[PDB]
Design a protein around this ligand. Sequence first.
Ligand SMILES: Cc1ccc(OC[C@H]2CCCN2C)cc1C(=O)N[C@H](C)c1cc(-c2cnn(C)c2)nc2ccccc12
Ligand SMILES: [Cl-]
Ligand SMILES: [Cl-]
Ligand SMILES: [Cl-]
Ligand SMILES: [Cl-]
Ligand SMILES: [Cl-]
Ligand SMILES: [Zn+2]
Ligand SMILES: [Zn+2]
Ligand SMILES: [Zn+2]
Ligand SMILES: [Zn+2]
Ligand SMILES: [Zn+2]
Ligand SMILES: [Zn+2]
Length: 312
Amino acid sequence: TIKVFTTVDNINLHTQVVDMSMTYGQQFGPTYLDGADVTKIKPHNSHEGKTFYVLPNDDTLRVEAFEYYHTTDPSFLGRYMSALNHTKKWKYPQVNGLTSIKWADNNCYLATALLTLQQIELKFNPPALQDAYYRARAGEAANFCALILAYCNKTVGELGDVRETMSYLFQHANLDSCKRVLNVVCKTCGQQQTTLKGVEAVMYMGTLSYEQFKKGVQIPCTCGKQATKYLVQQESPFVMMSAPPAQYELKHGTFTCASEYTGNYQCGHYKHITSKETLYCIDGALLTKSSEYKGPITDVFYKENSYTTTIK
Ligand SMILES: Cc1ccc(OC[C@H]2CCCN2C)cc1C(=O)N[C@H](C)c1cc(-c2cnn(C)c2)nc2ccccc12
Ligand SMILES: [Cl-]
Ligand SMILES: [Cl-]
Ligand SMILES: [Cl-]
Ligand SMILES: [Cl-]
Ligand SMILES: [Cl-]
Ligand SMILES: [Zn+2]
Ligand SMILES: [Zn+2]
Ligand SMILES: [Zn+2]
Ligand SMILES: [Zn+2]
Ligand SMILES: [Zn+2]
Ligand SMILES: [Zn+2]
């Protein structure tokens, strides 16, 4: 017989003694070692002393699972371990002082999101996400990338959209203090003010330019006549401006980072543009730099703290 450790969070470890005759699935249930399904695998000698991930089978494991992951989905652990099995074999090179991902299994949208998260201020609510976030910034982003896929209900190889991945991650972050006050202007109905909170206060779909959002954009009113919507007040550490892929010029120092999308719908490829001392383009493990940039951009990220418009 061998002595092992079972856990759901890799923190609260539980001591267990197993029988080498019965497989792990008969004694613990669905069991995993470093992302590998060891349910139908009998206990081995190298397995002694190692820590095993198990699906919660009692209330103590269930409670511990929620405190770390903030989910009660019984499929989360398996989807997490299934993604981890791939992400542990990916390469995570340091590029321009940032942790990127060598291209594999259509992970270009994951690398772009990973590079973006290292350049904006964000705090994740699930301790599992925050801990992996920290380790990702230090260069060990395998667990973080697997968690992103599990939280987004995406599998390795699936075609991913960066704007949708960021929105899913934003919903698992503390954006309660983020406030956005808007104002619509219609020739017939008049002027109406709205206040957005949370994820809706930091994301917009329609234009890439934060300045254009401040000046105003044409949105259709409920009466038929076109209206004008502009930003009144913004209280957030950042702002994400999105638009369908189109040719766009990125000026050095006017933005934080941006998402470049080339190719067909869903089947395209992502690249990451970041504004440093000069404009840098990160394509997985490849790095290029230029003083100017013009290309198909679909997301742009800007810095912010507090903004109040001057329009009367
Ligand atoms: C890469 C990718 C993976 C999946 C995916 O779809 C999953 C969606 C489907 C609906 C629900 N969710 C599962 C889309 C893409 C993709 O290609 N994203 C680029 C940036 C893109 C966006 C838009 C567009 C226009 N409006 N909105 C709101 C987004 N249009 C594009 C037109 C041409 C080329 C790229 C476009
Ligand atoms: Cl929650
Ligand atoms: Cl959740
Ligand atoms: Cl790719
Ligand atoms: Cl979700
Ligand atoms: Cl959460
Ligand atoms: Zn939560
Ligand atoms: Zn793989
Ligand atoms: Zn969720
Ligand atoms: Zn009206
Ligand atoms: Zn109107
Ligand atoms: Zn790709």
